[PDB]
């Protein structure tokens, strides 16, 4: 009920979509970062043994657990009308989430690898599915009925798009420079449409 | 309205679309593209990726739908297969996310030479497949009903059947004598939707 605790390990990993949803909805939460050396003793206490996870405690001390980051974000976005106003908007929200998920899948391949292997996979996907999936997302952004990803108000599709673009720029600062104008335009409109999210991203840097 | 499902893999990502329409009692048409035809068909598909759904009205106007699970979620939404409440809606998505992880491991073995396929097959069966199966079994016990979420069919039920069939493709005997909640879910699901049972029986 009352207190929402986000348990995670990666600084800007899958938990970013939970935080950005809560911030855009104006809901408070507490960060609980688990460390590498502590994870062996913490894992048996997490249902499913996987992070990130969400812990909810009420006025009375009863603990409710929530698993699977994007499932958690979908629930919080639904509760605050960030999953489309209609069934047709709901589809378009999920359509962009699915495409963002594919781009995130390619980015994830480079994670937790030795320096030489990480460089090899980065070089491979940047010449591969990353530009192909970026063009697909740009077409989905152009088909919007408003200034944001789906319609004119914030939805979950807006948030996971910001998170995955920051992952792309992590692979290459210059990869989007002078290209993909609809992606640059989406972020500018999104910051202008939610000052709380802009406050969150500005202070995070 | 005519629903055309465009796909290439016999039992790929489109299975969740078919099973949703079958459980809802909505008709559709299978349109399988071939490997040698794909070079000429791809420029006609928005996004250039399959599977995709093509909707034609009574007047001939075409509207396209992309991203299989986004299509399935929309069809399940229109026929009340995404949970009756917001809390049930979360429970459907929790199991879909876990099924998605199991499908992600299965996909690594796909469309590779025989020896490479066997090696990756060995790695995930001794790796994340049993770990993710135990997680799915725990979510099945936590349901308030006989199925995956509640007592009526949801999208979580359908994607679970599809991913379990992919597991048995890796190893016919991997679930033999194990994971009783998974065996019990399928048994309850077939009894709870005769159309789906007809679809799976005739498919074999
Ligand atoms: Na995370
Ligand atoms: Na398919």
Describe this structure in words.
Chain A is of the alpha+beta class and 205 residues long. Chain A folds into 2 domains: 1-81, no CATH class; 82-205, no CATH class. Chain A is 54% helix and 9% strand. Chain A has helices spanning 16-24, 39-42, 69-79, 87-108, 115-126, 129-142, 156-171, 181-193, 195-204, and strands spanning 3-8, 30-33, 53-57, 63-66. The radius of gyration of chain A is 18 Å and the shape is globular. The A-B interface holds A 47-50, 66-72, 74-75, 78-79, 87, 90-91, 94-95, 97-99, 105, 132, 136, 139 and B 46-49, 65-71, 73-74, 77-78, 86-87, 89-90, 93-94, 96-98, 104, 131, 135, 138. The structure holds sodium ion (2 copies). The PDB classes it as transferase. The entry lists the keywords Glutathione S-transferases, Schistosoma bovis, Schistosoma, bovis, 28-kDa, Sb28GST, GST, transferase. It forms a dimeric assembly. The apo-crystal structure of the 28-kDa Schistosoma bovis glutathione transferase.
